[PDB]
Amino acid sequence: RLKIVTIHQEPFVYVKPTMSDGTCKEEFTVNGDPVKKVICTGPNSPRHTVPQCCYGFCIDLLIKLARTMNFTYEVHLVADGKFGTQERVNNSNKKEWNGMMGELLSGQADMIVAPLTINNERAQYIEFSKPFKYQGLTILVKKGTRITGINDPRLRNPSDKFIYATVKQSSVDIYFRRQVELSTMYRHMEKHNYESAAEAIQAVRDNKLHAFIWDSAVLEFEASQKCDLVTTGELFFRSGFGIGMRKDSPWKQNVSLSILKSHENGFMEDLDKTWVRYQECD
Numbered sequence: 001r002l003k004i005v006t007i008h009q010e011p012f013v014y015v016k017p018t019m020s021d022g023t024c025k026e027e028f029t030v031n032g033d034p035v036k037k038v039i040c041t042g043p044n045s046p047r048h049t050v051p052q053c054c055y056g057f058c059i060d061l062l063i064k065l066a067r068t069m070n071f072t073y074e075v076h077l078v079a080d081g082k083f084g085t086q087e088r089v090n091n092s093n094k095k096e097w098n099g100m101m102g103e104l105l106s107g108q109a110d111m112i113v114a115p116l117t118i119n120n121e122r123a124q125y126i127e128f129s130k131p132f133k134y135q136g137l138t139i140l141v142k143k144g145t146r147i148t149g150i151n152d153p154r155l156r157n158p159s160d161k162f163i164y165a166t167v168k169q170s171s172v173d174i175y176f177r178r179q180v181e182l183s184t185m186y187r188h189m190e191k192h193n194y195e196s197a198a199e200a201i202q203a204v205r206d207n208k209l210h211a212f213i214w215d216s217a218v219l220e221f222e223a224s225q226k227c228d229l230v231t232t233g234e235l236f237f238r239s240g241f242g243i244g245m246r247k248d249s250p251w252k253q254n255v256s257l258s259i260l261k262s263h264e265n266g267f268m269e270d271l272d273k274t275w276v277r278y279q280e281c282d
C-alpha cells in the first residue's frame, strides 16, 4: 500500500473532522453525485494526530490514479503542514527538505498528491509527473484595493502602510530567491509570512494583510467564492502542479500516462466543473 502525503488546500484538498462514529458525513456534488471521501490521518496547545475526512479535486484524482494503476493506499497530512523548501537543519550546513518534499525524500511518503508546484529546484531531488493543472502565481486583495501586479510600487517599494506576504516554505520563496529585487521583497515578506494559506486568506478578509501572493488556482477559487475578495494583476511565474515521486520510481511513467488520458477525455475538465467553477460567491 502506497503512503500518500497531502496537505489541506481548498478546493484541491478539504479536511474535515469525522462524525462521532468515525465515519465521514454523506454529501453530494453539484451534479448530485456522492462526494468521494477518504480517511486521512494528520494533525488536528498540544499537537494531536487523528483520522480526518479528506475530499476534493486532488482526492478525486488520487482515486482515479489508484484505480487506473491498480494500487492501494493510505493518506496522511504532512506533519509540518508545509509544501517544501530546502534549508539548513540542526544549525549545521547539512541541508534537508521540509514539508511534503521532505516526507517523500525520507520515505514517510511514497507519493505526493496535492497542488504541488513543479520547479527546477525540486526536480533536482524528486521526479514529477507531467502537469495535471496549469496555473501560476497571482495576488489576493480585499475588493476595492488597487494594485497593478507584482510590479506595483506598493510591492516594489514596501511600506508599513501596505502589508503583503505569502505562506512560508512554499514555491513562492523558491521563485523570489531567483531575482535580486524579488529577494529583497521576500526578506520584507519574511516578517509577515503566514503558516498556511487559509490563515493568510483570513487575514486579508480581516484587513490585517493587504495582499497575499499565492497560487492562482487556489486564489481564483477563493476569490470566486467570497464576494469580498478579488485577485489582481497579471499572473506571473506560470507553472503547473504535478504528482511527486522519488527519483527512478516505478510509478512515474504510468502516472503521467493516466494524467495524459485525463487531459484527453474530459476527466480533468469535469473535475474543474465539480470543484472549481460551479456556483456564485456566498
Ligand SMILES: NC1(C(=O)O)CCC1
Pocket: 083, 084, 115, 116, 117, 118, 169, 170, 171, 172, 214, 215
Ligand atoms: N503550490 C505551492 C507549492 O509550494 O507547491 C506554491 C504555493 C504552494
